[PDB]
RNA sequence: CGAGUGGCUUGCUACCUCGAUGUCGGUUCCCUCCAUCCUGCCCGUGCAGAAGCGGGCAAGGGUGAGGUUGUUCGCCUAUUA
RNA sequence: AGCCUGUGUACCAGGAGGGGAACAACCCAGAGAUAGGUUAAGGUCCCCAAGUGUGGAUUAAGUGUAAUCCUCUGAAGGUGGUCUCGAGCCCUAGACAGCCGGGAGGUGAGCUUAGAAGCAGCUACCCUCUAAGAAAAGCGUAACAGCUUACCGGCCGAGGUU
């Protein structure tokens, strides 16, 4: 098998060994694409993913490599953004960005601030009760969004009743 | 310090067992061997199981004792000893004329023995002796 | 008591009631189920085939049968289908319940000897195989692994 | 060779006389 | 109803010891197993909360004092995570 | 049951030597001494004599590297883990999936019921417009609304489905 991904005019993609880097007006993302007998190479205007095998396990990764690359194309041009909404019922939850980590205070009345560190070059811009996680590395952005939501996780009590927390409102 | 090796073998990206089997055979033929870059030697398989085996060996023991190495240094050497009759005169001689090293203290670059190299491009399930030692608790002195 | 004790056909055939007394009654309720008024005039005919020779105690027969027919009420108490269990527990079974002295056991039950590949059950249905499910439940209560086989039915 | 498709290409050609692929079909007639 | 795992109970067998391998219980002192009682981290709930019930990972540590009985076991009391 | 008790046979007992990690009866083998040679069972990555042998395929579990067996467990049941072979049906007159658009009216059918309008229950389930569209397959409402399946069209482009 072999698949050819024509790279966008807006982008440049270089690759040495098992590492591929993609640079666009929005940034640069480098990934490792390592799997038995699957070669990834930049042939001038197109990135090539090929292998001499066609077994289910191989095809699976090939398809995965593809989406991973295309996702990088998209991240260096249009970028990736996740929209989130802080929400509380009794205690005013305060979500702030301090340093390279978003901090949340007064969660359900907690005295101890809950926090999480942002992944990579992900921007977490907060405006009122709305948050916007964005960056060129979908991996990083996606996690930072997630981590933020996970950060208000509650196991001790009935979630249906204690719904406070920040949630992913719009997935790219 | 200073070891007149008739042969210097480079373990980097080689199957430990296959290297050892050959280093054993040569030492018994009278050759003085030195294994280099042990920390970069490799063993195929699911890292989770592999590590369980070596962790078990560390835990095994009693007053009589079962001293099992944690550094990629000894791990490799113990592997070789298992392929020599180290309790016989001949065996102990052969074993003692073989030493394993972390990295390469020589000037010459060791040679790669046939059939012992692992192609990283067509293999994802394998582990580095160094990785194992770090898991075991060794002090990464390399 | 476990099937482990009687599932094997390693003992001589022991069925002569003229020389054996005190044989427990069978727990199997019926052998003909459904519309026994009608004859096999159905489009589809599925069978449950035993894949290993074994002895099946009337215990398992009743449980296997009930579990299947009781379920075949996905068609209704008076549904259109007929169910048949073609085997009967002829083999009398003993238990030595003195230690190994005078150990010829006493009659404790009956079992049916089935040979690998025979069909123990046979159902007759119109293209409405809810029976295929009645059987997944039946071979669930008998010792051997089994094959659910469909004969007259090229309506796949 | 679906028949309903064959009949449509006809009915279409009929109104043309007095799916896109089916229209393009009739047009080719 | 069917299929199993363990080798703590009970039974079976009579392989080992009758030129003897000292009994039960207790005690003291050491190691271990996990099928987890508590503790840590979790899932479900007929999960509002609190208090529970059930389940998963998990053997690091803990699992105590007494009344009857030689008892093992067990019954009983007050403490206890 | 490494149980008890028959039977036929070969073995141990009273049978070496080779192999099986060890091991009365499993395998080769029945054996005077000494010597050369070739095999048997079994084995040829090292320990350990002989292949890191050849053509091809499978397995990712260290499954396995365990003829036989008190000794080497692993079952019923289950598996879109993966590989191989077959049959039927659908498809460039554009299939399968996804996304977009359409899902219309007589009409909120009749009946019952204050009520019931696709969807409490009962009966029926007709015809119009049309490229589609049930007298409604599933949610939802006090009943409506709302959200979708069926059904049609578009985008897409290659196998798909049982
Ligand atoms: Cl020790
Ligand atoms: Cl030795
Ligand atoms: Cl691999
Ligand atoms: Cl002889
Ligand atoms: Cl292993
Ligand atoms: K004795
Ligand atoms: Mg609570
Ligand atoms: Mg003594
Ligand atoms: Mg456990
Ligand atoms: Mg402990
Ligand atoms: Mg004798
Ligand atoms: Mg040799
Ligand atoms: Mg194993
Ligand atoms: Mg066997
Ligand atoms: Na290995
Ligand atoms: Na040890
Ligand atoms: Na007696
Ligand atoms: Na079964
Ligand atoms: Na058992
Ligand atoms: Na004695
Ligand atoms: Na004692
Ligand atoms: Na513990
Ligand atoms: Na007491
Ligand atoms: Na003899
Ligand atoms: Na031997
Ligand atoms: Na193994």
Q: Is the CB of C101 under 7 A from strand E?
A: yes
| Contact indicator for C144, C51 with CB cutoff of 8 Å | yes
Distance CA A56, CA A63 (A): 11
Mark which of A28, A56, A79 sits at the end of a domain. A79
Same domain (yes/no): A97, A164:
yes
B122 vs A: CB within 8 A: yes
From the CB of residue A60, how many other CB atoms can be counted at a distance below 10 Å? Answer: 11
Mark which of A57, A79, A101 sits at the end of a domain. A79
- The experimental resolution of this structure, in angstroms, equals 2.8
Give residue D12's region: left, alpha or beta (phi > 0; psi -120 to 50). alpha
DSSP string of A43-54?
A: ETTEEEEEES--
The CATH number for A30's domain is 3.90.930.12
Nucleotide nearest B22, CA–C1', reads: F46
Indicate the number of domains in chain B. Answer: 1
Nearest-10 Cα torsion for B5, B11, B12, B15:
170
| Contact indicator for C95, C38 with CB cutoff of 8 Å | no
Domain range enclosing A44: 1-79
Task: Please give the distance of CA B39 from its chain centroid, rounded to a whole number.
Answer: 8
Burial of A86 (0-12, 13-18, 19+ CB in 10 A): buried
Take residue C94 and report the two structure tokens written for it: 């003993």
Instruction: Report the structure determination method.
Output: X-ray
Distance CA A50, CA A60 (A): 12
CB within 8 A of C138, min separation 6: which ones?
C48, C64, C65, C67, C68, C121
DSSP string of D1-29?
A: --HHHHHHHHHHHHHHH--HHHHHHHHT-
Residue C144 DSSP symbol: S
Q: Do chains A and B touch (3 or more CB pairs under 8 A)?
A: yes
Take residue D6 and report the two structure tokens written for it: 């064959």
From the CB of residue B95, how many other CB atoms can be counted at a distance below 10 Å? Answer: 20
Nearest-10 Cα torsion for C51, C53, C58, C63:
-20
Positions of chain breaks in chain C, given as the residue before each break (C to N > 2.5 Å): 97
Nucleotide nearest C141, CA–C1', reads: E2
Q: Is the CB of A156 under 7 A from strand E?
A: yes
The CATH number for B42's domain is 3.90.1180.10
Same domain (yes/no): A96, A172:
yes
Strand-strand pairing, C82-85 and C119-125:
antiparallel
Domain range enclosing B85: 1-142
Q: Which of C38, C33, C34 is nearest to C62 (CA)?
A: C33
Place of tokens 């992913």: A168
Distance CA C105, CA C22 (A): 12
Nucleotide nearest C111, CA–C1', reads: E1
Identify the three-state secondary structure at position A23.
Answer: strand
Distance CA B99, CA B32 (A): 9
Q: Chain A residue closest to B120 (CA)? A: A36
- Give the side-chain half-sphere CA count within 13 A for B135: 18
**Which A residues 18-47 touch B at CB under 8 Å?**
34-37
Distance CA A152, CA B2 (A): 61
Q: Which of C137, C91, C128 is nearest to C112 (CA)?
A: C91
Measured between alpha carbons, how far is residue C43 from residues A56, C100, C106, C132 in Å?
40, 56, 47, 15
Same domain (yes/no): A126, A70:
no
Q: Which of B84, B86, B98 is nearest to B34 (CA)?
A: B98
Please name the CATH architecture into which domain C1-156 falls. Alpha-Beta Complex (3.90)
**Which residues of chain B does A35 touch, with a Cβ-Cβ cutoff of 8 Å?**
124
Take residue B12 and report the two structure tokens written for it: 């980097």
Task: Please give the distance of CA B114 from its chain centroid, rounded to a whole number.
Answer: 16
How long a stretch of residues is chain C? 156
Same domain (yes/no): A73, A100:
no
Residue A149 DSSP symbol: H
Distance CA C149, CA C48 (A): 6
Take residue C58 and report the two structure tokens written for it: 């009337």
Q: Chain A residue closest to B126 (CA)? A: A36
Identify the three-state secondary structure at position C18.
Answer: coil
Vertex B5 angle, CA B3 and B6, to 5°: 155
DSSP string of C19-67?
A: T---PPPP----SEEE-TTS-S--SEEEEEEESS-EEEEHHHHHHHHHH
Quick check: B124 and A37 CB within 8 A? no
Distance CA A117, CA A162 (A): 25
Burial of B57 (0-12, 13-18, 19+ CB in 10 A): middle
Distance CA B59, CA B70 (A): 11
Same domain (yes/no): A58, A125:
no
Quick check: A34 and B124 CB within 8 A? yes
Same domain (yes/no): A86, A171:
yes
Place of tokens 């694409």: A33
Alpha carbon of A149 to ligand 25 centroid (Å) = 68
Mark which of A50, A79, A108 sits at the end of a domain. A79
Q: Which of C11, C108, C8, C126 is nearest to C56 (CA)?
A: C8
Same domain (yes/no): A45, A101:
no
Q: Which of C122, C49, C54 is nearest to C84 (CA)?
A: C122
Strand-strand pairing, B7-10 and B33-36:
parallel
Same domain (yes/no): A37, A74:
yes
């Amino acid at each position: 098998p072999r698949v050819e991904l024509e790279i966008p005019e807006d982008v440049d993609a270089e690759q040495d060994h098992l590492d591929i880097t993609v640079e666009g007006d929005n940034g640069s993302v480098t990934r490792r694409l390592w799997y038995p007998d699957i070669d990834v190479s930049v042939d001038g205007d197109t990135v090539v993913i090929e292998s001499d095998e066609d077994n289910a396990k191989t095809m699976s990764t090939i398809g995965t490599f593809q989406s991973h690359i295309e996702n990088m194309f998209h991240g260096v041009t249009e970028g990736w953004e996740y929209g989130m909404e802080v929400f509380y019922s009794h205690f005013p939850m305060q979500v702030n960005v301090e340093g390279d980590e978003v901090v949340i205070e007064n969660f359900l009345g907690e005295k101890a601030p809950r926090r999480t560190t942002i992944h990579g070059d992900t921007d977490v811009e907060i405006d009122g009760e709305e948050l916007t996680v964005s960056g060129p590395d979908i991996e990083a952005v996606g996690q930072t969004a997630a981590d933020i939501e996970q950060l208000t996780r509650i196991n001790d009590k009935d979630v249906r009743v204690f719904q406070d927390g920040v949630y992913i409102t719009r997935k790219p | 310090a200073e070891f007149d090796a008739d042969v210097i073998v480079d373990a980097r990206d080689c199957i430990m067992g296959r290297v050892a089997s050959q280093v054993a055979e040569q030492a018994l033929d009278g050759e003085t061997v030195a294994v280099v870059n042990a920390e970069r030697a490799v063993i195929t398989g699911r890292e989770e199981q592999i590590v369980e085996k070596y962790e078990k060996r560390v835990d095994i023991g009693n007053d009589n004792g079962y001293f099992y190495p944690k550094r990629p240094d000894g791990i490799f050497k113990r592997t070789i000893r298992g392929m020599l009759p180290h309790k016989k005169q001949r065996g102990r001689e052969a074993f003692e004329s073989v030493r394993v090293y972390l990295g390469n203290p020589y000037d010459e670059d060791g040679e790669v023995l046939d059939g012992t190299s692992l192609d990283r491009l067509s293999n994802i399930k394998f582990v580095t002796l160094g990785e194992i030692s770090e898991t075991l608790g060794a002090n990464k002195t390399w | 008591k476990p099937g482990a004790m009687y599932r094997n056909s390693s003992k001589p055939a022991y069925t002569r009631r003229e020389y054996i007394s005190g044989i427990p009654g069978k727990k199997i309720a019926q052998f003909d189920m459904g519309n026994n008024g009608a004859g096999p005039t159905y489009p589809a005919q599925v069978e449950l085939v035993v894949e290993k020779p074994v002895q099946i105690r009337h215990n398992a027969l009743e449980a296997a049968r009930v579990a299947a027919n009781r379920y075949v009420q996905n068609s209704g108490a008076a549904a259109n289908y007929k169910f048949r269990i073609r085997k009967f527990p002829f083999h009398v079974i003993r238990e030595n319940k003195d230690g190994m002295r005078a150990p010829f056991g006493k009659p404790v039950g009956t079992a049916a000897r089935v040979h690998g590949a025979n069909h123990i059950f046979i159902a007759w249905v119109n293209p409405d195989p809810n029976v295929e499910e009645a059987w997944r439940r039946a071979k669930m209560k008998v010792t051997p692994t089994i094959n659910i086989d469909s004969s007259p039915a090229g309506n796949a | 060779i679906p028949e309903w498709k064959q009949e449509e290409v006809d009915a279409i050609v009929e109104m043309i006389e007095s799916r896109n692929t089916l229209l393009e079909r009739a047009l080719d007639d």
